[PDB]
Amino acid sequence: SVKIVTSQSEFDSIISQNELVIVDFFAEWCGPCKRIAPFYEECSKTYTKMVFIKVDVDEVSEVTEKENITSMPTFKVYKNGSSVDTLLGANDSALKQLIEKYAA
């Protein structure tokens, strides 16, 4: 169950309250963006050791500035409340290997 956080601090909070956190910075008008969620959901079930959340750029622009979100869709894994890995474009297979690396 991917988590949807609409607050700026809530987003940052998730990042710091866990050892490993994977969050997909994505935006509401693309087919892939929504399309990557279904696979993301599967990944959240086996990878339940890693915390999965979703944060849009429109509702929380401040979030974009926090990680300087430049290329979307962007999938970044956070370790110890910080950056660790970056994935360009939302692919089920690309994330499979990315999420698998820390989450397996």
PDB file of C-alpha atoms in Angstrom, residues 4 10 16 22 26 29 33 38-39 41 43 46 53 56 61 70-71 77 83-84 104:
ATOM      1  CA  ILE A   4       0.157   9.468  -0.161  1.00  0.00           C
ATOM      2  CA  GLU A  10       4.960  14.942   6.613  1.00  0.00           C
ATOM      3  CA  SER A  16      13.752  10.796   8.748  1.00  0.00           C
ATOM      4  CA  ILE A  22      11.471   5.037  -1.191  1.00  0.00           C
ATOM      5  CA  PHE A  26       5.474  12.030  -9.682  1.00  0.00           C
ATOM      6  CA  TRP A  29      -1.644  14.218 -16.057  1.00  0.00           C
ATOM      7  CA  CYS A  33       2.953   8.058 -13.762  1.00  0.00           C
ATOM      8  CA  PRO A  38       0.376  -0.824  -9.854  1.00  0.00           C
ATOM      9  CA  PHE A  39       3.859  -2.345 -10.038  1.00  0.00           C
ATOM     10  CA  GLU A  41       2.137  -1.655  -5.192  1.00  0.00           C
ATOM     11  CA  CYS A  43       6.982  -3.958  -4.767  1.00  0.00           C
ATOM     12  CA  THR A  46       7.457  -7.909  -0.688  1.00  0.00           C
ATOM     13  CA  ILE A  53       5.324   6.932  -0.081  1.00  0.00           C
ATOM     14  CA  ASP A  56       3.429  15.159  -5.947  1.00  0.00           C
ATOM     15  CA  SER A  61       6.455  22.308  -4.451  1.00  0.00           C
ATOM     16  CA  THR A  70      14.554  18.310 -11.921  1.00  0.00           C
ATOM     17  CA  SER A  71      13.649  15.191 -13.937  1.00  0.00           C
ATOM     18  CA  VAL A  77      15.587   5.902  -2.257  1.00  0.00           C
ATOM     19  CA  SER A  83      19.630  10.443  -0.702  1.00  0.00           C
ATOM     20  CA  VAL A  84      20.989   7.054  -1.747  1.00  0.00           C
ATOM     21  CA  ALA A 104      15.275  -6.828  -2.519  1.00  0.00           C
TER      22      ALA A 104
END
